[PDB]
């Protein structure tokens, strides 16, 4: 994923260099984060940027001749804020006050029109700034469309779907086209169809009398793209993450790897402790930080004492690492305290028992007493709401006689703002009710693929190994360990596409399913051998290949990949990907690492507390 950092920097810094003299830079707060990922303020100051302003708080000044704006053009908010600052700057400025505006990869006519209507933008220098798929992590590419999840499913707003297919085109057009496109879900299909049409646009530009025709050859380095919609798995997002990174996100929240507590230290995979602890189970990490403290203290507080240069130099060259580890260790110890206060208080373990018991198919009413205690203890809003939703999603619809008991805890837990919470849950389809006309679990060949159908967990729990009691928290052999045995469907639906061996072992579930093992093991390509399961999930199925004479040549080269020539695989989550899913994808990516490089691609990274607080953040 880090290879795109140069591209993102290239375009951002190029446009800034085009501005002569000293300039003030105005950055959208909701874009500044993603920008901070690729460049530092010092990177921008090296290009002549002096002051740093924001649009939302109307922060302006007249200190520089050139004023430069960076913002998303998918909303009028920025066009208005920019025009507002321009009008104020021109009124107070005693200089030429040249203005420059940098927009999304394709600046919109709407944005430009709104700017022009201001009457003060007539001399403005407006240009495209094609930043997409920000390098949030070495294995993760994110468009950072943080509001994508909410808008994409509350209003069915396709904006992130359109941006994603374009952003994906923005990669494959340079690294070669995906020889195969597959995916599951309504929005997943849209992305797959958009990618096919965008390829036609690249040839059509010549026929349109515009840009030169692209060769559009298939990639020799990229094997495939897998696109999965958020609507496909509405159960996984409702479980609390048990990993260390999950502890941080579940209690505090991770954005831009920055996060609240000090903004002096960034926590990411480059950290020597985080790369080892981030995927650790909460029951284990409490012992890993002590393991780190013992090994760190031995080299940091001892061994080097009284040593002469000949031996001391071994610790001197490493000391900077020991100091960083000690600083990160204290931070990690503070996170450990946060979990300890929930495990010694029967809060974290209590919600886990509910998640494990529901996953196994236990009657959800039996877990109600455990949920009531969590509400009574004033645990965080998203931690109670997840349990007050998951129970219905697992069952596939429950009678109102029982739903009301859980619903009472939703209104009691959220207060008068619960009205927005319930409306968002229904619109986001994260709450099921038997009384609904949409309360229909997909049946075998039951004309599946409609927007009014839901994934049949109660069937797929037998078709796939979604229930795992074999998880090893310290040394796991399955993704299920992230949830201590949940074996999340959103990942199984990807694993069964990524490798035929995964398909063979994943579908080896109940005694009426394992008979298909020999068929599942033949799924060398596409969805073959997985049709029984694909047909029982929500939304349509997409499977198409790249056209052209050399398509077979590239396909053979890509299926001939080896450890000395690893091939890249794109896994795409539409509507945003949760941290539990990212950790699960890293686990499988490591197992397949010997042959292929699997990269996680998303419209956004969903915080565990972002989905259940939609009624809180939009209520502020």
């Amino acid at each position: 994923a880090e290879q795109v950092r140069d591209k993102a920097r290239k375009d951002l810094l190029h446009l800034l260099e085009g501005v002569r003299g000293k300039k003030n830079l105005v950055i959208e707060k909701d874009l500044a984060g993603p920008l901070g990922v690729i460049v530092k303020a010092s990177t921008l100051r090296d290009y002549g940027v002096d002051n740093f302003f924001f649009l939302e708080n109307k922060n302006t000044g007249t200190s520089q001749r050139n004023i430069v704006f960076i913002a998303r053009g998918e909303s009028v908010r920025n066009a208005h804020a920019i025009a507002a600052q321009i009008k104020r700057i021109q009124r107070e400025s005693q200089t030429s006050h040249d203005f420059h505006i940098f927009w999304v990869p394709r600046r919109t006519l709407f944005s430009d029109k709104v700017l022009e209507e201001a009457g003060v933008l007539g001399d403005a220098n407006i240009s495209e700034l094609p930043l997409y798929f920000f390098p949030l992590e070495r294995d993760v590419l994110s468009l950072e469309l943080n509001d994508s999840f909410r808008d994409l499913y509350l209003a069915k707003d396709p904006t992130p779907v359109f941006l994603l297919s374009r952003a994906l085109m923005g990669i494959q057009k340079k690294h070669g086209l995906f020889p195969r496109i597959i995916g599951k879900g309504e929005n997943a299909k849209r992305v797959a169809d958009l990618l096919s049409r965008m390829r036609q646009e690249l040839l059509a530009g010549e026929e349109a009398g515009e840009s030169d025709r692209a060769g559009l050859s298939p990639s020799t380095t990229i094997e495939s793209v897998i696109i999965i919609d958020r609507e496909v798995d509405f159960v996984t997002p409702l479980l609390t993450q048990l990993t260390y990174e999950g502890l941080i996100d579940e209690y505090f929240g991770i954005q831009n790897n920055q996060t609240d507590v000090k903004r002096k230290i960034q926590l990411d995979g480059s950290d020597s402790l985080y790369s080892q602890l981030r995927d650790a189970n909460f029951a284990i990490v409490g012992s890993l930080l002590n393991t780190v403290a013992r090994r760190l203290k031995s080299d940091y507080e001892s061994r080097h004492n009284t040593k002469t240069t000949a031996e001391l130099k071994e610790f001197v060259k490493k000391l900077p690492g020991y100091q960083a580890e000690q600083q990160s260790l204290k931070i990690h110890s503070n996170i450990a305290e946060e979990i300890i206060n929930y495990t010694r208080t029967e809060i974290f373990n209590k919600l886990l028992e509910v998640q494990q018991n529901l996953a196994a198919g236990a009657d959800p009413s039996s877990q109600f007493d455990s949920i009531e205690e969590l509400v009574a203890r004033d645990t965080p809003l998203p931690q109670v709401l997840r349990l007050l939703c998951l129970y219905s999603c697992i069952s596939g619809g429950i009678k109102t006689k029982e739903l009301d008991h859980f619903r009472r805890l939703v209104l009691q837990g959220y207060g008068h703002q619960h009205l927005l919470t319930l409306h968002n849950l229904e619109r986001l389809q994260m709450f099921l009710s038997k009384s609904s006309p949409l309360a229909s679990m997909i049946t075998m060949s039951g004309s599946s693929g409609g927007p009014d159908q839901k994934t049949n967990y109660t069937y797929l729990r037998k078709q796939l190994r979604l229930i795992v009691d074999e998880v090893n928290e310290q040394d796991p052999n399955d993704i299920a360990y992230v949830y201590s045995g949940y074996a999340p469907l959103s990942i199984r639906l990807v694993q069964c596409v990524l490798q035929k061996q995964y398909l063979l072992s994943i579908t080896k579930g109940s005694g009426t399913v394992i008979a298909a093992g020999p068929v599942a093991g033949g799924g060398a390509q596409g969805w073959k051998g997985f049709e029984e399961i694909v047909k029982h999930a929500r939304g349509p199925t997409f499977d198409e290949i790249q056209k052209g004479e050399d398509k077979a040549v590239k396909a053979r080269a890509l299926l001939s990949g080896s450890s000395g020539d690893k091939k890249t695989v794109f896994v795409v989550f539409v509507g945003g990907i949760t941290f539990t899913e990212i950790a699960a994808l890293r686990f499988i990516a490591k197992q397949e690492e010997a042959r292929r490089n699997i990269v996680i691609c998303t419209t956004s990274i969903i915080n565990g507390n972002r989905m259940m607080n939609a009624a809180i953040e939009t209520a502020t």
Binding site: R344, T345, E346, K350, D369, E372, E373, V375, A376, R377, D378, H405, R408, L409, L411, Q412
Partner: protein, 139 residues
């Protein structure tokens, strides 16, 4: 907040007004009363009404709250879920003699012996353990 501030009559109105489950109301009152360290009101829920709650999450609001003397009145009542917990929790509270008393009530001679081992060579505690031992392993 209503319980913590002593507005119990108002908390009851809220419980009935919004259909709050008894289990929820009990855990809320217990946590708020612990914050105020009101020993008598806590007993009204778990000792006098025998609320059907786990003792593990209960004592985490009492013993970890710095009130081992308050736990002492709920420990012997743990026989409703697990009689072995009437000894273990007394030991955790430092109540070695009371743990021996429970060993007597349940006729657990192994639990009694563990309390004697804890007393070690200190007769200041050993005398009480032996006094209670006379009623655990004698008949």
């Amino acid at each position: 907040k209503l319980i913590k501030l002593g507005y119990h009559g108002r908390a009851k109105k809220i419980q009935s007004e919004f259909k709050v489950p008894e289990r929820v109301a009990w855990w809320i009152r217990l946590q708020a009363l612990v914050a105020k360290r009101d020993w008598n009101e806590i007993e009204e829920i778990s000792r006098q009404r025998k609320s059907p709650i786990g003792w593990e999450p209960f004592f985490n609001q009492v013993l970890q709250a710095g009130n081992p003397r308050l736990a002492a009145t709920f420990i012997p009542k743990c026989t409703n879920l697990e009689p072995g917990q009437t000894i273990t929790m007394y030991e955790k509270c430092g109540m070695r003699v009371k743990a021996a008393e429970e060993a007597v009530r349940l006729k657990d001679t192994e639990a009694w012996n563990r309390l004697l081992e804890a007393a070690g060579r200190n007769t200041a505690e050993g005398r009480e353990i032996e006094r209670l031992g006379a009623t655990v392993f004698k008949k």
